[PDB]
Design a protein around this nucleic acid. Structure first.
Lengths: 93, 98, 87, 107, 583, 107, 93, 86, 95
DNA sequence: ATCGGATGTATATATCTGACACGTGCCTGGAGACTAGGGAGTAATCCCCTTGGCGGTTAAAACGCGGGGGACAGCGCGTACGTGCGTTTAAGCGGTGCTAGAGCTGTCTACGACCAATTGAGCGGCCTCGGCACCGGGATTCTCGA
DNA sequence: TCGAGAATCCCGGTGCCGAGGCCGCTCAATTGGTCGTAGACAGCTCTAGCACCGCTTAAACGCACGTACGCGCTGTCCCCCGCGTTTTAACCGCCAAGGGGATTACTCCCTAGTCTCCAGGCACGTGTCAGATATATACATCCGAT
């Protein structure tokens, strides 16, 4: 039985960063746990907002708000930049 | 002869007083002017219900009280009965703010 | 001269030496060294600086120019400082 | 009809399908706007890019073609922002940054 | 018609009022009319209209009627009051404990009048720290006294103790501060309980808005608050004006003052004491710099693009004077020192350049009035920029600094033409006649303000002319509000014109007030409808000498010709300083 | 049919109806078993009973028929268990327990 | 417009504890915030369990588990005792 | 046929080990008394962890304690590790 | 013989330069199970899980040292003492 | 600062081994195609509270300025502690069997969702009146020099 | 150390206002149907803990012993507290409109949701280099001795 992860994606990202670099399994695992962690925090926060402003749905907007919460400085800046810009380009189609 | 109490006796008698008393000890306005002054730096021109500001003054004053009592311990553990900045930045350094 | 007022008190002087002293007292420091006042200010600063931002943050998505006691309440909570009494 | 993945249509590496799915199962809101999953997925991708680059550099410090958790601990703890982020979490096989208190160094 | 509703209220609800122990018949029924001045009156004598309205109130309270007085200042309303009270102790023999309350400012002089008049009978005052208080508090707790004088502070404070004792008559002064419903005085009287009689005063009654009449009047009788809620219908509609509040409320409302003729006294000094030489009255126009306009246009956007809380912030600051936030000047001039372009920026300044010199050349002393005294800041150094002899004062100048400085500029030889003020704050009550000239940079923003700004100089003893001098720049909001409260300038003279027949109490008055009225409005719509200082040069003659020598001030600035009038562009700070003003 | 409230049927003071309602809106699980809301509501009721009793006693310490937040701060901070629970939260109008470090007391 | 709270309930509980005692408003408010707090924690935890053991529903059982988590010592003991016992008595009908 | 109640693996915790730890921790010279204290704290810490991870397996109704229940317990106190899942 | 403490430093270099868990597997385990006895008896433990605990512990200690180290330093003493520990925990609030 | 050494620590030279990366195959899970719907949008009023200077009041901030005592360093002993060194157990290993216990699966059944109809507990508002703030007079106690 | 000085408290009499108690009235709780189903459960298959033995060397331990860090006392001197003095600004009563926030009302564009189906990805194999690890050496960093 399969158990899904992000690993291959992580790997390809490395191929978009230090494409010549190897990764130990254990490292990969760490990355996975890391990701799903961050994901947890985010989803929690957004959910919170949806509750407070009492909307029945989550959009990109709430997400962005939460991002501005968690990730300080350059993280917020570059990051939110990237989220927005991706939303744009994709949503062109 | 004038009447002066031995040094620090006043300080103690206060500490009894304050521990024995509830209210916020920091003047309302200056605190406020500070607050708004700060909020300027993010998005300008923001109405603040007095209540909310009151809350902030809670969080602050309490927060300080904690930070003292600990830094107090620090200096004590240095066998010095008067706090010094190194003691503070030590205390925050342990709570990890540093 | 007069018409140019640009020379003025910085704030956080607004936090008064005697006040700070009083709080140290309620917390129970008996004898205070001077410089602490100075440093004390700095500390308080950071505090607000982290909190109020996040507070604004909720008012941020509120899209409503006013920040009620909520964003306080919450934002503090998002520090694990969660507070009581206001709802 | 011709199907294709939104992540491809975003030109990004995270299966917004899977993401979205997780979102709904997550009981977060009763409903989900289609922008959120994209936006988020991208965010993740950026993060990973960051941490990866930094670590892999740290591997090159010893010129180790493969990355080990030690590297991770090092890179992450080095950065201000991240180590701020992760300070409440441990990395496995962590070790600790080279660290010495001045007072203990000899003349 | 509705006059009969009025009548019903008259007879019946009056009966209820006197239970609480035209009108003109029934209000004046109880007859005591005495033209004497009483016995113990000492140290001066009435201007005996003072006897007349005196006697009027005498009948009021003998009719069992409280009252409200509109009288102009300088008529010694003080005495009138006093002698009245003296009479109560005196022929009335009543000796009732009587509360009198004033603003802290004048209470000194009011005491002084007890001195000049009735030391014969006691007073009790309050001020000056706890000790004096608790002392004389024992005194009144001792119950022995004649008069008790105070201000509003300790009314608030001791008011419990005060209220403990029963009361016969109760006086209220500057009573237009009752102007506001919830200004605590009233309700603190409800708790404080009351005296069987009462009185309210005003130097100037207030806005034709007229809760003004209400809070007061309602407070005079319960009849008046209920009935005057039916007249919340009436006066809610009090102003199709020619169909309702112009042709008709001649009858309706001017006969509502005809209603209030038994209820009011007002008098006119320049009718009785008639010592006003003259006042010659003017308003003019000015340009505002491209900043103060073209950018201010863009800063209309910036009013919505702080740059915010527009009216007092945007409109009045910018449309008055520049660099209120000082990045204007500094960005432009970092040296920040006085220079050219300070006269240039707001036309008021370069104007001052075109007028103040001639003032000196004509040697005529100037008093002016302001808001957010910060503007006057520029003034100082602006004056310094020529180094001109002047003084300054604001609402923040201290009390004895104030009294002092008064004396100082009041020096008959005082080299100061310019003693410059904040309107309501610095002004308060004053008479300064050592200045012969008055100038205004600002709106009335309710009339009575710049009415004070009138009454500083030509109040009794200033016999020189009076140029009333106003700066309203071309295409400006000061135009707007100017004709707003200046509507009120035809509105005050209108319902208060009704006050202007009821003053004398005679109808021929209102009959002059007919075309006083309608002619006034004629003027008001002449307003259904750009100045070169040549013309001003020709309007500034209080003699023809002034014409000659000032035209030769223009020999001077003629042949040495003085740069552009306004700041007119620079252009990098248009976009950049625009966006920094786009905040 | 004759209706009656479950909380009555539990003989408890918290409207299990309201509680349950809140639960579902809370997006917690897609479904709710009927035992949970009761059980919880009771739990709350117990807690409140605890804190109340303790505080009100503390009011009797000054014999103040009415309870003030000061009391709350005092009682809560006094107990080990609770103050353990609430140490991460401030009480409004708190004040602090009478507290002195030995070293600062005079002879 | 109403805004619901627990106040009256709190009050009645006092009537079941120190029935002769008064309460200031502000106190009452504190109590409310306190309660909804605790409630938050609980619901969160239970929810968590439901997720981990992957059930679509929450019963009393999960609740109890979470209670055993949060409230130490006598709290757990007396408390869980009371929850259970109440469940019993009520569920008799 | 084994249930053997263990004795003082806390005393099983060796002095040299703790030493090694502080060394990585950077400390240079060490007091004697430290050993006892440190051991005790380590204990109570463990207690607080195990009690809850157990609590999980309790409700899981299973004989065995996963790495997971450990993890959940840790985060559940505010301490998180990565690499082991979750 | 090297001057006192020189060894200690050289180690600290070593350890900081090296990854692995420093506490012997078994004793740690026997301890762990020994503890779990006290709640519900007889519980199988995947080696992995125990490994995790040994992580959380060892790391946790490392922190606690480094801080207590600071404490003693701030007392101007180069050797830690229990008061310093219980101080440090006292600030993190475990006390 | 050398005298010189002796050892810390990275280099040179194989190579061995292990996870790591390439090729696989199917699968369920993401994508499209379509209808549906209240959730939000968008805007309407209403209205409570928001931002500009002033007169007066006090209590507290500012500041001055002793002396007293607490940092504060210095310094002389000591004893516990760092250390190495030869003793010394035991973890660790690995390998061998052991099964109980994880882990997965068909089933149905009681249970939750949902709704519709019913309603009286909770809430919003409205007096009020005893708890409480205060006080100031007077009753005591704590402080510091004998 | 007693003393009286200064502090604090105690209390009986002191207005006052939220705690509470009252009373309409809804909507949210409750009833009783139903139906879909998730979980109980009862049944099973095979992994991974787990006991035990041989063996190895490390690693822990005792100690033998210098010594260097802690600890205690002294003289200093410096700045903090106490208090008195004198200032200044919070602080509260005010003037003076705009607005933003609150609420409610009516319309679609968005969403979920259903079904279909085609592949992208994961489990799962298999070649194969990274580097871990073992020998062999040299300047880089201690440590007496000069």
């Amino acid at each position: 039985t399969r158990k899904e992860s992000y690993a291959i994606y992580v790997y390809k990202v490395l191929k978009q960063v230090h494409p010549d670099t190897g990764i130990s399994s254990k490292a990969m695992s760490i990355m996975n746990s890391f990701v799903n962690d961050v994901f947890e925090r985010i989803a929690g926060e957004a959910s919170r907002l949806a509750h407070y402003n009492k909307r029945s749905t989550i959009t990109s907007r709430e997400i962005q708000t939460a991002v501005r919460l968690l990730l300080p400085g350059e993280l917020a800046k570059h990051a939110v930049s990237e989220g927005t810009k991706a939303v744009t380009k994709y949503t062109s189609a | 002869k004038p009447h002066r109490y031995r040094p620090g006796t006043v300080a103690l008698r206060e500490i009894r007083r304050y521990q024995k008393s509830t209210e916020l000890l920091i003047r309302k306005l200056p605190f406020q002017r500070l607050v708004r002054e700060i909020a300027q730096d993010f998005k300008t021109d923001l109405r603040f219900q007095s209540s909310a500001v009151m809350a902030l003054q809670e969080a602050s004053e309490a927060y300080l009280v904690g930070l003292f009592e600990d830094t107090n311990l620090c200096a004590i553990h240095a066998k010095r009965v008067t706090i010094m900045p190194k003691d503070i930045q030590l205390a925050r350094r342990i709570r990890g703010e540093r | 001269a007069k018409r140019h007022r640009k020379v003025l008190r910085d704030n956080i002087q607004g936090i008064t030496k005697p006040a700070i002293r009083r709080l140290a007292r309620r917390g129970g420091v008996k004898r205070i060294s001077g410089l602490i006042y100075e440093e004390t200010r700095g500390v308080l600063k950071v505090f607000l600086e982290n909190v109020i931002r996040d507070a604004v943050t909720y008012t941020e998505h509120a899209k409503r120019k006013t920040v009620t006691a909520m964003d306080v309440v919450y934002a503090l909570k998002r520090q694990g400082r969660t507070l009581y009494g206001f709802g | 009809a011709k199907a294709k993945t939104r992540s491809s249509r975003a030109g990004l590496q995270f299966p917004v399908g899977r993401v979205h799915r997780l979102l709904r199962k997550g009981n977060y809101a009763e409903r989900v706007g289609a922008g959120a999953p994209v936006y988020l997925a991208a965010v993740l991708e950026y993060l990973t890019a960051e941490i990866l680059e930094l670590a892999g550099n740290a591997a090159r410090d010893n010129k180790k073609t493969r990355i080990i958790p030690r590297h991770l601990q090092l890179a992450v703890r080095n950065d201000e922002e991240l180590n701020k982020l992760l300070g409440r979490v441990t990395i496995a096989q962590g070790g600790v940054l080279p660290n010495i208190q001045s007072v203990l160094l000899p003349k | 018609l509705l006059d009969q509703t009025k009548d019903t209220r008259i007879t019946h609800l009056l009966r209820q009022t006197n239970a609480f122990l035209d009108y003109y018949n029934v209000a004046h029924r109880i007859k005591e009319d005495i033209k004497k001045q009483p016995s113990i009156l000492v140290g001066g004598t009435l201007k005996d209209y003072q006897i007349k309205g005196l006697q009027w109130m005498v009948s009021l309270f003998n009719n069992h009627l409280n009252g409200i007085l509109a009288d102009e200042m300088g008529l010694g309303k003080t005495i009138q009051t006093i002698s009245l009270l003296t009479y109560l102790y005196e022929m009335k023999n009543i000796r009732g404990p009587y509360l009198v309350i004033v603003p802290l400012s004048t209470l000194s002089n009011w005491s002084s009048e007890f001195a000049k008049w009735a030391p014969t009978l006691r007073t009790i005052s309050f001020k000056g720290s706890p000790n004096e208080r608790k002392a004389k508090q024992a005194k009144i707790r001792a119950g022995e006294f004649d008069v008790v004088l105070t201000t509003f502070e300790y009314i608030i404070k001791e008011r419990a103790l005060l209220s403990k004792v029963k009361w016969v008559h109760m006086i209220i002064d500057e009573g237009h501060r009752m102007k506001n419903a919830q200004s605590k005085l009233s309700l603190t009287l409800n708790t404080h309980y009351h005296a069987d009689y009462r009185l309210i005063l005003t130097g100037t009654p207030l806005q034709n808005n007229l809760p003004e009449l209400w809070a007061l009047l309602n407070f005079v009788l319960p009849k008046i608050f209920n009935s005057v809620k039916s007249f919340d219908e009436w006066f809610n509609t009090p102003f199709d004006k020619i169909e309702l509040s112009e042709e008709e409320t001649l009858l309706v409302i001017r006969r509502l003052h005809k209603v209030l003729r038994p209820f009011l006294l007002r008098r006119l000094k320049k009718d009785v004491e008639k010592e006003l030489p003259d006042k010659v009255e003017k308003v003019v126009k000015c340009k505002m710099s491209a900043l103060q306009q073209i950018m201010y246009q863009q800063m209309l956007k910036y009013r919505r693009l702080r740059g915010f809380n527009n009216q007092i912030m945007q409109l009045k600051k910018i449309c008055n004077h520049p660099f209120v936030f000082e990045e204007v000047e500094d960005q432009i001039n970092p040296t920040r020192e006085t220079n050219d372009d300070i006269w240039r920026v707001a036309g008021k300044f370069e104007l001052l350049d075109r007028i103040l010199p001639k003032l000196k050349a004509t040697g005529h002393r100037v008093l002016i009035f302001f808001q957010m005294t910060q503007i006057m800041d520029i003034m100082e150094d602006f004056l310094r920029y020529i180094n001109i002899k002047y003084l300054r004062l604001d609402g923040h100048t201290k009390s004895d600094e104030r009294s002092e400085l008064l004396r100082l500029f009041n020096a008959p030889d005082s080299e100061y033409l310019c003693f410059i003020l904040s309107t309501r704050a610095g002004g308060l009550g004053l008479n300064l006649q050592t200045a012969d000239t008055v100038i205004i940079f600002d709106t009335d923003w309710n009339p009575h303000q710049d009415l004070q700004a009138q009454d500083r100089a030509h109040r009794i003893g200033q016999k020189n002319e009076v140029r009333i001098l106003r700066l309203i720049t071309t295409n400006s909001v000061e135009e707007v509000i100017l004709e707003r409260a200046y509507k009120k300038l035809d509105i005050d003279g209108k319902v208060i014109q009704a006050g202007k027949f009821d003053n004398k109490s005679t109808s021929e008055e209102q009959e002059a007030l007919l075309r006083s009225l309608l002619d006034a409005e004629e003027e008001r719509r002449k307003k259904r409808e750009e100045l070169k200082d040549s013309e001003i040069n020709e309007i500034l003659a209080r003699n023809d000498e002034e014409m000659a020598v000032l035209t030769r001030m223009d020999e001077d600035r003629s042949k040495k010709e003085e740069k552009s009038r306004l700041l007119e562009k620079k252009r990098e700070e248009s976009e950049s300083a625009a966006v920094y003003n786009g905040r």
